[PDB]
Design a binder for this molecule. Structure first.
Ligand SMILES: Nc1nc2c(ncn2[C@@H]2O[C@H](COP(=O)(O)OP(=O)(O)O)[C@@H](O)[C@H]2O)c(=O)[nH]1
Ligand SMILES: Nc1nc2c(ncn2[C@@H]2O[C@H](COP(=O)(O)OP(=O)(O)O)[C@@H](O)[C@H]2O)c(=O)[nH]1
Ligand SMILES: [Mg+2]
Ligand SMILES: [Mg+2]
Lengths: 256, 256
């Protein structure tokens, strides 16, 4: 359908306001939708990875400075690569913890909204699983209840996957980290390239990336394309683009 | 000659180690106390050994699990300031997912802060708002428990230092990030090894490390050696080893 993404939810001075042009594109989708949203700290490769789910080299804009780039929530509606009569809806979002914004409540509001619209929720962190990232995920989850399948991605991962002398998979690392989201999954990613090639990463063909990184991305994408389910609402109703439009309006209005 | 544990943390019970207290009380020279704090698995222990001018000291280790526990102390001669002892504090990193005791983290944070005359705050990739909020929270809390130079170290730094179209020094990046610790400084460090051969980093010589990283560590160390001052109590009272020991006892109680 769409050749580029567009802003679904604007955030100019921290006001969550829907964008009509994107809303109108949503309601013209009568197919069931798979909604994959991405959330994590800012400057963390989120936009760059989501473009991989689209199969295109560019899409959500990625930038290379210390300053945040993505604002609000962005949407890309494309045919599901495996699944006939299904549309893949990608939600790319403004990273949390931007020091120039310094507005945790706006952060929490963007988080909650991406978590409410998604059927697959991609939580993007760097190096390792941090307790603060778990606590934030938990707290937004509790707020989201009072008003999806978890894919925890670990970027620039090099620590030994080793707990008390035993080699573990990322999935077992994630499981070990959450002991005292029914469907959970955890994907690791190497440093995509050497550090001085990182700013131009978008323009680099697979040839010039870390070979393992390329396979880890294909692994991440294949899992999504073949396990991420149609967005579902209580009462065995299946969400199409029109119903997702209503949820966007419902949730935006309830948050503000 | 080798660091020893100052504050033990078995079962998240903070307790003083009498052997380290007794070494401190025999130091009559003024002390320059440098403490490092950051999230776990962030190369704190590795960096602190650079200040000691010894390739080995504080133990590092390379798996997803936390390694350093409690607070370790290492009293070494100041490299260029006669009759001054450089007291290095290496701390258990924050946010360890196996710990399930957020209160214990904050107490280690407060203790390191209360004892330091130079406080090194070690973060990865970027300054993020959660790290500032945590610094502010703990700084506010230590002023109650009392009823210091800040050096922000940015590890694995690749983002462009450019804000609103203008190049920034690390100092300016810190200042822009903190804009709504009287003395403040900031330092960037490249990825040290241009191969994620990071797990054996402690064994490599400088010629196999990233050269920019070697030069960045030297500048960090030079600043600590030239700018860090003797720990000072209110009233211009200058802290020697014997006085620092009683500081440790006072604050361990105030934190309990
Ligand atoms: N270290 C690292 N950098 C990345 C990765 N993916 C992308 N980048 C670079 O990180 C910078 C910010 O990426 P971006 O997609 O804008 O991150 P976002 O702010 O989280 O959406 C860009 O210069 C990217 O080229 C990764 O996996 N690791
Ligand atoms: N990526 C990266 N790894 C590092 C750096 N410094 C040390 N390491 C590696 O990171 C791991 C953790 O080091 P350690 O000092 O024990 O981390 P700590 O828990 O913060 O004390 C070890 O494998 C080190 O070899 C760095 O600047 N960048
Ligand atoms: Mg982005
Ligand atoms: Mg350590």
């Amino acid at each position: 359908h769409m050749s580029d993404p567009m802003c679904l939810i604007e955030n100019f001075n921290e006001q969550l306001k829907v964008n009509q042009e994107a809303l109108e594109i949503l309601s013209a989708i009568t197919q069931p939708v798979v909604v994959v949203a991405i959330v994590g700290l800012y400057r963390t490769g989120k936009s760059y990875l989501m473009n991989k789910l689209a199969g295109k080299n560019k899409g959500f804009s990625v930038a290379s400075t210390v300053q945040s780039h993505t604002k609000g929530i962005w949407i890309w509606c494309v045919p599901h690569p495996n699944w006939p009569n299904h549309t893949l809806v990608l939600l790319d979002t403004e990273g949390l913890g931007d020091v120039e914004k310094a507005d945790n409540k706006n952060d929490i509001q963007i988080f909650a909204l991406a978590l409410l619209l998604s059927s697959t929720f991609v939580y993007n962190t760097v190096n390792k699983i941090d307790q603060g990232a778990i606590d934030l995920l938990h707290n937004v989850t509790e707020l989201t209840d009072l008003l999806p399948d978890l894919v925890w991605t670990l970027r620039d991962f090099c620590l030994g996957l080793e707990i008390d002398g035993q080699l573990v998979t990322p999935d077992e690392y994630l499981e070990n980290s959450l002991r005292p989201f029914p469907k959970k999954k955890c994907f690791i990613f190497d440093l995509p390239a050497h550090q001085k090639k990182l700013a131009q990463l978008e323009t680099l063909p697979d040839d010039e990336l870390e070979p393992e990184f390329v396979q880890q991305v294909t692994e991440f994408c294949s899992y999504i394309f073949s396990h991420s389910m149609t967005k579902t609402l209580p009462g065995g109703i299946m969400v199409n683009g029109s119903r997702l439009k209503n949820l966007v309006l419902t949730y935006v209005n309830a948050i503000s």
